Design a binder for this molecule. Sequence first.
Ligand SMILES: [K+]
Ligand SMILES: [K+]
Ligand SMILES: [K+]
Ligand SMILES: [K+]
Ligand SMILES: [K+]
Ligand SMILES: [K+]
Ligand SMILES: [K+]
Ligand SMILES: [K+]
Ligand SMILES: [K+]
Ligand SMILES: [K+]
Ligand SMILES: [K+]
Ligand SMILES: [K+]
Ligand SMILES: [K+]
Ligand SMILES: [K+]
Ligand SMILES: [K+]
Ligand SMILES: [K+]
Ligand SMILES: [K+]
Ligand SMILES: [K+]
Ligand SMILES: [K+]
Ligand SMILES: [K+]
Ligand SMILES: [K+]
Ligand SMILES: [K+]
Ligand SMILES: [K+]
Ligand SMILES: [K+]
Ligand SMILES: [K+]
Ligand SMILES: [K+]
Ligand SMILES: [K+]
Ligand SMILES: [K+]
Ligand SMILES: [K+]
Ligand SMILES: [K+]
Ligand SMILES: [K+]
Ligand SMILES: [K+]
Ligand SMILES: [K+]
Ligand SMILES: [K+]
Ligand SMILES: [K+]
Ligand SMILES: [K+]
Ligand SMILES: [K+]
Ligand SMILES: [K+]
Ligand SMILES: [K+]
Ligand SMILES: [K+]
Ligand SMILES: [K+]
Ligand SMILES: [K+]
Ligand SMILES: [K+]
Ligand SMILES: [K+]
Ligand SMILES: [K+]
Ligand SMILES: [K+]
Ligand SMILES: [K+]
Ligand SMILES: [K+]
Ligand SMILES: [K+]
Ligand SMILES: [K+]
Ligand SMILES: [K+]
Ligand SMILES: [K+]
Ligand SMILES: [Mg+2]
Ligand SMILES: [Mg+2]
Ligand SMILES: [Mg+2]
Ligand SMILES: [Mg+2]
Ligand SMILES: [Mg+2]
Ligand SMILES: [Mg+2]
Ligand SMILES: [Mg+2]
Ligand SMILES: [Mg+2]
Ligand SMILES: [Mg+2]
Ligand SMILES: [Mg+2]
Ligand SMILES: [Mg+2]
Ligand SMILES: [Mg+2]
Ligand SMILES: [Mg+2]
Ligand SMILES: [Mg+2]
Ligand SMILES: [Mg+2]
Ligand SMILES: [Mg+2]
Ligand SMILES: [Mg+2]
Ligand SMILES: [Mg+2]
Ligand SMILES: [Mg+2]
Ligand SMILES: [Mg+2]
Ligand SMILES: [Mg+2]
Ligand SMILES: [Mg+2]
Ligand SMILES: [Mg+2]
Ligand SMILES: [Mg+2]
Ligand SMILES: [Mg+2]
Ligand SMILES: [Mg+2]
Ligand SMILES: [Mg+2]
Ligand SMILES: [Mg+2]
Ligand SMILES: [Mg+2]
Ligand SMILES: [Mg+2]
Ligand SMILES: [Mg+2]
Ligand SMILES: [Mg+2]
Ligand SMILES: [Mg+2]
Ligand SMILES: [Mg+2]
Ligand SMILES: [Mg+2]
Ligand SMILES: [Mg+2]
Ligand SMILES: [Mg+2]
Ligand SMILES: [Mg+2]
Ligand SMILES: [Mg+2]
Ligand SMILES: [Mg+2]
Ligand SMILES: [Mg+2]
Ligand SMILES: [Mg+2]
Ligand SMILES: [Mg+2]
Ligand SMILES: [Mg+2]
Ligand SMILES: [Mg+2]
Ligand SMILES: [Mg+2]
Ligand SMILES: [Mg+2]
Ligand SMILES: [Mg+2]
Ligand SMILES: [Mg+2]
Ligand SMILES: [Mg+2]
Ligand SMILES: [Mg+2]
Ligand SMILES: [Mg+2]
Ligand SMILES: [Mg+2]
Ligand SMILES: [Mg+2]
Ligand SMILES: [Mg+2]
Ligand SMILES: [Mg+2]
Ligand SMILES: [Mg+2]
Ligand SMILES: [Mg+2]
Ligand SMILES: [Mg+2]
Ligand SMILES: [Mg+2]
Ligand SMILES: [Mg+2]
Ligand SMILES: [Mg+2]
Ligand SMILES: [Zn+2]
Lengths: 150, 87, 50
Amino acid sequence: VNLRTQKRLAASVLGCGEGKVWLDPNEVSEISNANSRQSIRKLVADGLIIKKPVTMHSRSRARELNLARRIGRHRGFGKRKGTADARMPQQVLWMRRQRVLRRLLVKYRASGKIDKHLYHELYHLAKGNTFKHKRALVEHIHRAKAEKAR
Amino acid sequence: TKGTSSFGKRHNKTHGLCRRCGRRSLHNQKKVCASCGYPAAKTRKYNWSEKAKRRKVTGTGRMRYLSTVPRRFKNGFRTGVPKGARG
Amino acid sequence: PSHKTFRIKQKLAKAQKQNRPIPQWIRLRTGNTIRYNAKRRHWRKTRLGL
RNA sequence: AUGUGCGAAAGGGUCCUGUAAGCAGUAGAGUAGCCUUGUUGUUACGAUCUGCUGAGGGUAAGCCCUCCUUCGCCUAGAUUU
RNA sequence: AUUAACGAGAUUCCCACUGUCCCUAUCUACUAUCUAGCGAAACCACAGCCAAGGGAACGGGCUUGGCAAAAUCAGCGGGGAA
RNA sequence: GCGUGAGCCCGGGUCGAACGGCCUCUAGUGCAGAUCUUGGUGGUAGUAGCAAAUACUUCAAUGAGAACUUGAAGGACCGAAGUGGGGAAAGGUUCCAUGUGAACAGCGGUUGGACAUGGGUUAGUCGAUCCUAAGCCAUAGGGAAGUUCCGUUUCAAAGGGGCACUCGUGCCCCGUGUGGCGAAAGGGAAGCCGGUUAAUAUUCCGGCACCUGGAUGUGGGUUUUGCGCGGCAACGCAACUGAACGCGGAGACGACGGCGGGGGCCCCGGGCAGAGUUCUCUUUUCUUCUUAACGGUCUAUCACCCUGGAAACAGUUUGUCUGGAGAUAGGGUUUAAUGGCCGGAAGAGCCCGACACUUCUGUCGGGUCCGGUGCGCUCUCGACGUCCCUUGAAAAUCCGCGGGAGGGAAUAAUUCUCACGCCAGGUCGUACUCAUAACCGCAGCAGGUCCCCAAGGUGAACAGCCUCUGGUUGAUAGAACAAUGUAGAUAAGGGAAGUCGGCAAAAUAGAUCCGUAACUUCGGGAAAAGGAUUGGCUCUAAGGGUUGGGCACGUUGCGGCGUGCGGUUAACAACCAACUUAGAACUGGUACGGACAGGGGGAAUCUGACUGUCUAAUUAAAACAUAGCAUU
RNA sequence: AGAGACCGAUAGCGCACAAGUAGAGUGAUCGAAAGAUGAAAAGCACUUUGAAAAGAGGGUUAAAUAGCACGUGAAAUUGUU
Ligand SMILES: [K+]
Ligand SMILES: [K+]
Ligand SMILES: [K+]
Ligand SMILES: [K+]
Ligand SMILES: [K+]
Ligand SMILES: [K+]
Ligand SMILES: [K+]
Ligand SMILES: [K+]
Ligand SMILES: [K+]
Ligand SMILES: [K+]
Ligand SMILES: [K+]
Ligand SMILES: [K+]
Ligand SMILES: [K+]
Ligand SMILES: [K+]
Ligand SMILES: [K+]
Ligand SMILES: [K+]
Ligand SMILES: [K+]
Ligand SMILES: [K+]
Ligand SMILES: [K+]
Ligand SMILES: [K+]
Ligand SMILES: [K+]
Ligand SMILES: [K+]
Ligand SMILES: [K+]
Ligand SMILES: [K+]
Ligand SMILES: [K+]
Ligand SMILES: [K+]
Ligand SMILES: [K+]
Ligand SMILES: [K+]
Ligand SMILES: [K+]
Ligand SMILES: [K+]
Ligand SMILES: [K+]
Ligand SMILES: [K+]
Ligand SMILES: [K+]
Ligand SMILES: [K+]
Ligand SMILES: [K+]
Ligand SMILES: [K+]
Ligand SMILES: [K+]
Ligand SMILES: [K+]
Ligand SMILES: [K+]
Ligand SMILES: [K+]
Ligand SMILES: [K+]
Ligand SMILES: [K+]
Ligand SMILES: [K+]
Ligand SMILES: [K+]
Ligand SMILES: [K+]
Ligand SMILES: [K+]
Ligand SMILES: [K+]
Ligand SMILES: [K+]
Ligand SMILES: [K+]
Ligand SMILES: [K+]
Ligand SMILES: [K+]
Ligand SMILES: [K+]
Ligand SMILES: [Mg+2]
Ligand SMILES: [Mg+2]
Ligand SMILES: [Mg+2]
Ligand SMILES: [Mg+2]
Ligand SMILES: [Mg+2]
Ligand SMILES: [Mg+2]
Ligand SMILES: [Mg+2]
Ligand SMILES: [Mg+2]
Ligand SMILES: [Mg+2]
Ligand SMILES: [Mg+2]
Ligand SMILES: [Mg+2]
Ligand SMILES: [Mg+2]
Ligand SMILES: [Mg+2]
Ligand SMILES: [Mg+2]
Ligand SMILES: [Mg+2]
Ligand SMILES: [Mg+2]
Ligand SMILES: [Mg+2]
Ligand SMILES: [Mg+2]
Ligand SMILES: [Mg+2]
Ligand SMILES: [Mg+2]
Ligand SMILES: [Mg+2]
Ligand SMILES: [Mg+2]
Ligand SMILES: [Mg+2]
Ligand SMILES: [Mg+2]
Ligand SMILES: [Mg+2]
Ligand SMILES: [Mg+2]
Ligand SMILES: [Mg+2]
Ligand SMILES: [Mg+2]
Ligand SMILES: [Mg+2]
Ligand SMILES: [Mg+2]
Ligand SMILES: [Mg+2]
Ligand SMILES: [Mg+2]
Ligand SMILES: [Mg+2]
Ligand SMILES: [Mg+2]
Ligand SMILES: [Mg+2]
Ligand SMILES: [Mg+2]
Ligand SMILES: [Mg+2]
Ligand SMILES: [Mg+2]
Ligand SMILES: [Mg+2]
Ligand SMILES: [Mg+2]
Ligand SMILES: [Mg+2]
Ligand SMILES: [Mg+2]
Ligand SMILES: [Mg+2]
Ligand SMILES: [Mg+2]
Ligand SMILES: [Mg+2]
Ligand SMILES: [Mg+2]
Ligand SMILES: [Mg+2]
Ligand SMILES: [Mg+2]
Ligand SMILES: [Mg+2]
Ligand SMILES: [Mg+2]
Ligand SMILES: [Mg+2]
Ligand SMILES: [Mg+2]
Ligand SMILES: [Mg+2]
Ligand SMILES: [Mg+2]
Ligand SMILES: [Mg+2]
Ligand SMILES: [Mg+2]
Ligand SMILES: [Mg+2]
Ligand SMILES: [Mg+2]
Ligand SMILES: [Mg+2]
Ligand SMILES: [Mg+2]
Ligand SMILES: [Mg+2]
Ligand SMILES: [Mg+2]
Ligand SMILES: [Zn+2]
């Protein structure tokens, strides 16, 4: 008995690959009489032709390592292969910081904590490498208004 | 790399089928047949090859009209029908 | 190729109608000398020139 | 070809590595919860450490012993002088 | 005539390194090797054990001696002026 | 048996249609050699060999016969710059089904791209057909004995548009110009989803659309003084006359860099179904949860408009541009959906469950949700920037405008680019392969041959290594382990003593932190040279986003606001989210870029400045080219 | 159309035959091999062994020492006796 035609027809009807088609080993004579696509469907309904499941591929170990690195477990000096700028480029660090600092100054000026003359002077100070982060800018503003009070 | 490697790059055609003689001898870019000389009015023929002349001389084809002239000459190029024929 | 012209299509049709063996009753005629077909062509053996 | 026989296992000896899985602990840098607020207060997480443990694994394929462990086999078939 | 940088460009020395060497040993895979199946080519006057002699001045064959016992397998690189 | 000899004669066997002696005549008349010509056949010899691309094993069935046929079950490889899914050139039936003695598949064969008999390619929307490019060829003319050479707008009387016809015959305008071929990757009118076959499908069936050309009628629009209204404006609205002649726009264009928006893929959390594991653990691991063309409606950078008038200058990008030639601010208009919602459309497709059913046949229930994240990958759009002694096609075709020729109603008229309605769309290609077997290399040859799509982990990464979907298990086999080999490797002590010559091999190598000479065209040399660290576990610190802010009047089913104010919380509270960097303790046979991946260095001489190029198949160089300089 | 002191299938034209054919080359062009069963197919009915190809009997013929691998059937080279 030659069943090459039946296996090819089954894959098209089941919508799978020919490596996922199962033919009943004890009904080869009955299966060999199926020559049309209609007869293949009837043998699928009766349970002589089934589609096999996929092979296992799990990401359990992958997302386990990800969580351990959120608390700093696998990021030592013996675990780095690229350069510092390849892992975290400096241009991205600079671009983030300028957007953070410029977002704050617009917020203060809109509410009223500062006026435009102080806004302009702080803006060009931030363009220079003056304020290290958000905290440094806020402390500088408080001292500036304290001396302006006198 | 001349030889086996270079032979793999041959996938174009210098000549196609001629409309007058039927051989694959029509040059694709020049549009001139290398065998019968189409589209000139005369047919290409040279006296330094007797073999080539005999391959296409009169009598190598069908002679659709010329083969019935000797019979008409022998009877005098007459017209009409034989005496009291019907029709 | 799938792209063809009508002249090439006409040629390919004739080449396969001329590729069948001789009938059997030809071999029983009086004074016959034909044994087989001496002009058989195969796509894997001889290349036809367009 | 009945034997101090031949074969397949097993037990012991000899060598090689280096202390198995499992369970437990007043061991463990610390952390997060819950209560009567403890002299070990408990519940959860924890590389590793300690005990059972010179243990576990392998060992003739061209290592040794077994009348003192178990199971099987055997006085042919063919050719020639 | 000089000359920084550059070079799968030629040359000499130094440090490190090693079976390149003293001096050679051992292991793995595929062959070769044996079997079943399948199955070529180059080449070939006739052939195929030597020593000396003379000879076209370096013989497988001639002359005088040495000798000399079926059919065969794996390798080898002296000769066949291969 | 005869003859010195070339030769002649007879006996026996096989066989089946013509042949000889003697004298003259006549010639394509006698073979061992020519590396002689054509054909046939030996030894070598059952010999050399049939060894790149990791690999097969068990049971059953078929059959005279099974390592290389089919089913199931194991073990493996390709590892998304694939041994996957589709195409262009080229081939031409190699595609599908049934069957089969020989020959072919360098072993076998029940199998085959082989052999025999039948079957298979469906378009107004995908192409060709239309346009022009580099180029090729006609016409006017000039050469040449001539086959023919040049010439493409020229030293040419070179065209096209309208109106009635009694009925074609007849009238009237404009005129500088006047051929064709040439792209299945350039330019260009129009189709999407689901199903269906042994073999075709954006082509067949069902549903739902679109384009061009041709005729045409209803509804609506305009006009009673003739060809529409609104907005300060940018402009809007279902329409809303427009000939000759002319102006403009689209077609229509380079390479590279960072940044922002959108679709698809990847990743994380929850829920409903189904499956795998369960000595112990795991609210656990894996799979499905979809939405087309064509339309409606609300929005989305640039830019433009109105008010007003800026120095204590302001606005503002990751990247310094913008503004009295009018900024900030307040309010508007508009190019641009692959964005949200609705029609299409759940009736489809997909996942579960329960009954029928020899077949013919099926039938019925459920479900088909909700969020997050990013220097992620891929395609597309936008605003910016850099480079040039380099500035990056043409034509067909379609639209707007300037002008005002002609024509038209007061009961009808309307050459209204608005809605709906009627008819038609010819011809050729379409199967299959696109390569360790369908193309070219004499062949089923480790060679060569233009593209599209592109998953998880480690990691800087399209590096190497392992896996999922999909695909293979095909390269003659069985047994044994001699020499000599080809390919892969390790050696005590010495360390180039070997050799023409360190040829081959070994040694170094990622990342972080220190340190770095002579010389120099000041740019380099430079990763110069030379050092130290790196695992696991338990902790600590730093780098962000969104939403809230107190009174006094009036309106509104805690109101949301029209306001008059007051104020800068000595910056507080709640919620949300990935990664990157720095420090400490503990721990181990001191090991930790633990595989993969991965520079040896220095002091000098000769010579060419550098980057580039050549003898396809023995020479890659000091040879050629080059910028600069000089001469004619 | 008629002839010959011509050739007799490696000769005579390249071709006595489905020959300017099959086949090679991008192309111009290059270009073969291959005649004969018997007077007549009367071209082997039946039985038996074999999966089949075929063998052994038995038939036709004047002859199968003529079976379509077909008149006669030499040498090189090979098997048995
Ligand atoms: K233990
Ligand atoms: K112990
Ligand atoms: K060089
Ligand atoms: K050998
Ligand atoms: K053999
Ligand atoms: K001698
Ligand atoms: K002699
Ligand atoms: K006789
Ligand atoms: K043999
Ligand atoms: K192999
Ligand atoms: K393989
Ligand atoms: K068409
Ligand atoms: K139609
Ligand atoms: K066509
Ligand atoms: K057409
Ligand atoms: K042109
Ligand atoms: K002329
Ligand atoms: K085109
Ligand atoms: K069909
Ligand atoms: K109306
Ligand atoms: K209107
Ligand atoms: K273009
Ligand atoms: K983008
Ligand atoms: K994107
Ligand atoms: K996206
Ligand atoms: K991802
Ligand atoms: K469309
Ligand atoms: K100003
Ligand atoms: K930047
Ligand atoms: K790309
Ligand atoms: K008018
Ligand atoms: K098709
Ligand atoms: K197709
Ligand atoms: K193709
Ligand atoms: K990856
Ligand atoms: K990788
Ligand atoms: K060996
Ligand atoms: K060996
Ligand atoms: K040396
Ligand atoms: K020397
Ligand atoms: K290191
Ligand atoms: K010198
Ligand atoms: K160079
Ligand atoms: K060379
Ligand atoms: K070179
Ligand atoms: K040169
Ligand atoms: K100079
Ligand atoms: K001949
Ligand atoms: K040919
Ligand atoms: K007789
Ligand atoms: K007989
Ligand atoms: K005979
Ligand atoms: Mg920088
Ligand atoms: Mg050409
Ligand atoms: Mg009549
Ligand atoms: Mg001698
Ligand atoms: Mg001598
Ligand atoms: Mg000799
Ligand atoms: Mg002698
Ligand atoms: Mg040798
Ligand atoms: Mg020798
Ligand atoms: Mg006769
Ligand atoms: Mg002669
Ligand atoms: Mg001879
Ligand atoms: Mg002689
Ligand atoms: Mg051999
Ligand atoms: Mg092989
Ligand atoms: Mg070999
Ligand atoms: Mg195999
Ligand atoms: Mg691999
Ligand atoms: Mg693999
Ligand atoms: Mg097939
Ligand atoms: Mg078949
Ligand atoms: Mg074979
Ligand atoms: Mg065979
Ligand atoms: Mg077969
Ligand atoms: Mg065939
Ligand atoms: Mg089209
Ligand atoms: Mg011309
Ligand atoms: Mg002329
Ligand atoms: Mg054209
Ligand atoms: Mg195109
Ligand atoms: Mg229409
Ligand atoms: Mg107008
Ligand atoms: Mg929708
Ligand atoms: Mg929309
Ligand atoms: Mg503004
Ligand atoms: Mg809807
Ligand atoms: Mg449904
Ligand atoms: Mg197909
Ligand atoms: Mg392909
Ligand atoms: Mg190949
Ligand atoms: Mg081929
Ligand atoms: Mg990573
Ligand atoms: Mg073998
Ligand atoms: Mg070696
Ligand atoms: Mg050593
Ligand atoms: Mg040592
Ligand atoms: Mg040393
Ligand atoms: Mg070397
Ligand atoms: Mg260094
Ligand atoms: Mg140096
Ligand atoms: Mg140079
Ligand atoms: Mg060379
Ligand atoms: Mg070379
Ligand atoms: Mg004659
Ligand atoms: Mg002959
Ligand atoms: Mg002849
Ligand atoms: Mg004969
Ligand atoms: Mg017989
Ligand atoms: Mg006879
Ligand atoms: Mg014979
Ligand atoms: Mg004979
Ligand atoms: Mg003989
Ligand atoms: Zn021609």
